[PDB]
Design a protein around this ligand. Structure first.
Ligand SMILES: CC1(C)C(=O)N(c2ccc(S(=O)(=O)C(F)(F)F)cc2)C(=O)N1Cc1ccnc2ccccc12
Ligand code: NI
Ligand SMILES: [Zn+2]
Length: 277
C-alpha cells in the first residue's frame, strides 16, 4: 500500500523524449515538467518508469524507494521533484543531470591528465552527498562512478541507476546464480557475509577514487569475478594508478582497511580533503 501526497503531479504536465536507459523496474527517459519548480514554468527532468507487466507489490516497492528521497535536501544527492502514482504507467520525476553518469563522463576523457584539484573537487562532492545519506541512515550498497551523476556545471551528485543497464553488464556478477552483485566495488565483509554499512560505502568510495584516477578502468582487470572474491577476501588491494597523486592514493588506502572500523567516515574524508584548499 502507498498513499499519494503533495508530491503527486498530474501525468498531463510531464513530457518524455529520448530514453536514458533500462531501470530495475522499467525504462528511464529524458523529459520536461511544469509547476514542479518555483519561478520556472518548464523544468528538464529524468522520468523513471515501471513496465505495465510488473507486479503490484513491485509498483509499491518502486514508490516506497522514492518516498525515501522526500526526506532529503542535499545539493549533492539527485533531487526528487514529483510522483505520478495515479494510473499506468507509474512515474517518478527527478532533477535532470545533463552530463549523465560519472563513468561515461570519465571515459569520454581518454582519447583527448585531469588536475589533482578537479579530481579532489569531484571526490569532495561525492563524499558530501554520501555523508548526508549515511547520516539520514541510508547505505547505498552500489556506490560506483556509474551511479554518481554530473550536472551541466560539472558538479557531481550521488544517484542510483540500478543494476540493469546493458552498458555496464561487465560491472555485475550473478554470484551463486542469485541476484546481480557489483563484486569489483564490494568490501571484503560485503563479499563474505553480506554486511552492508556506511563503512562498506566508504570502501566503494575508495574504488570510485581509483575510477576517477584511472578514468573508469575496470577494477581488477584480468581477474575473473570468482578471482576478485578470493583476492579481496584474502586482503588484496588495487594498484596505485599510473600518474596517481600521493594524496589521492592515500585516501584510497584508508578506505580499503580490511577492518571496517579502521576506515574513515565520509565526515573525516571531507575534513581530510578540506585541509587541501
Ligand atoms: C534512474 C534515475 C532516474 C533514478 O531514479 N536515480 C536516483 C537518484 C537518487 C536516488 S537516492 O537519493 O536514493 C541515492 F541515495 F541513491 F542517491 C535514487 C535513484 C538516478 O540517479 N537516476 C538516473 C539519472 C538521474 C538524473 N539525471 C540523469 C541523467 C542521465 C542519466 C541518468 C540520470
Ligand atoms: Ni557543493
Ligand atoms: Zn520485489
Amino acid at each position: 500500500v502507498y498513499v499519494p501526497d503533495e508530491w503527486e503531479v498530474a501525468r498531463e504536465k510531464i513530457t518524455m523524449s529520448r530514453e536514458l536507459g533500462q531501470g530495475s523496474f522499467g525504462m528511464v527517459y529524458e523529459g520536461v515538467a511544469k509547476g514542479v519548480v518555483k519561478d520556472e514554468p518548464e523544468t528538464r527532468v529524468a522520468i523513471k518508469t515501471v513496465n505495465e507487466a510488473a507486479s503490484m507489490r513491485e509498483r509499491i516497492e518502486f514508490l516506497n524507494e522514492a518516498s525515501v528521497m522526500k526526506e532529503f535536501n542535499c545539493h549533492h544527492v539527485v533531487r526528487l521533484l514529483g510522483v505520478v502514482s495515479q494510473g499506468q504507467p507509474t512515474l517518478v520525476i527527478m532533477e535532470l543531470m545533463t552530463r549523465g553518469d560519472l563513468k561515461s563522463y570519465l571515459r569520454s576523457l581518454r582519447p583527448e591528465p585531469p588536475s589533482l584539484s578537479k579530481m579532489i573537487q569531484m571526490a569532495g562532492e561525492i563524499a558530501d552527498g554520501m555523508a548526508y545519506l549515511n547520516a539520514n541512515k541510508f547505505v547505498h550498497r552500489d556506490l560506483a562512478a556509474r551511479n554518481c551523476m554530473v550536472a551541466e556545471d560539472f558538479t557531481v551528485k550521488i544517484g542510483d541507476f540500478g543494476m540493469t543497464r546493458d552498458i555496464y553488464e561487465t560491472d555485475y556478477y550473478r554470484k551463486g546464480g542469485k541476484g546481480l552483485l557489483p563484486v569489483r566495488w564490494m568490501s571484503p565483509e560485503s563479499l563474505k557475509d553480506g554486511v552492508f554499512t556506511t563503512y562498506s560505502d566508504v570502501w566503494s568510495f575508495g574504488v570510485v577514487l581509483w575510477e576517477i584516477a584511472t578514468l573508469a578502468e575496470q577494477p581488477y582487470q584480468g581477474l575473473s569475478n570468482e578471482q576478485v572474491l578470493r583476492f579481496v577476501m584474502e586482503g588484496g588491494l588495487l594498484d596505485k594508478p599510473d600518474n596517481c597523486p600521493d594524496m589521492l592514493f592515500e585516501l584510497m588506502r584508508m578506505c580499503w582497511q580490511y577492518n571496517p572500523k579502521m576506515r574513515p567516515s565520509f565526515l573525516e574524508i571531507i575534513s581530510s580533503i578540506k585541509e587541501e584548499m
